[PDB]
């Protein structure tokens, strides 16, 4: 029956962006709102950003 059978496999690589949905294991749903720079993050006194 079917004559011309061409299947093409794309592969998109999606990163993360304002609007995706993340969640932990406990039921804490979330839509990631702002993708901040590294500088504006709350850093502890050791220097590492959260």
């Amino acid at each position: 029956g079917v004559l011309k059978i061409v299947k093409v496999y794309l592969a998109v690589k999606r990163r993360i962006q304002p609007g995706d949905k993340m969640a932990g294991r406990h039921g804490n749903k979330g839509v990631i709102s702002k993708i901040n720079p590294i500088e504006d993050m709350p850093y502890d006194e050791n220097g590492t950003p959260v």
């Binding site: 079917v2 299947k7 998109v12």
Partner: protein, 81 residues
């Protein structure tokens, strides 16, 4: 008549023959997005030609990782088959 797998895509100009070979179909790999052409697949009598050539959907990008073809015993040009 039957439809055809050829790059000789009509009306549309030097924006059809690009991510493909001289005998038609997407040439594998590449940074394809939306509105591109993957498999030239259009018939004559369908100055009466058209564009059913399966393209890339709107909004998606990607890399052609694999092309499978168990087509109608004939898909070949003069020899890739």
């Amino acid at each position: 008549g039957p439809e055809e797998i050829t790059a000789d895509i009509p009306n549309v100009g030097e924006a059809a023959l690009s991510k493909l070979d001289e005998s038609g179909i997407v040439y594998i790999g590449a940074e394809v997005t939306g509105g591109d052409i993957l498999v030239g697949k259009v018939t004559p009598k369908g100055s009466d030609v058209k564009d059913s050539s399966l393209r890339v959907p709107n909004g998606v990008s990607g890399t052609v990782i694999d092309v499978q073809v168990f087509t109608r015993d004939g898909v070949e040009k003069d020899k890739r088959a």
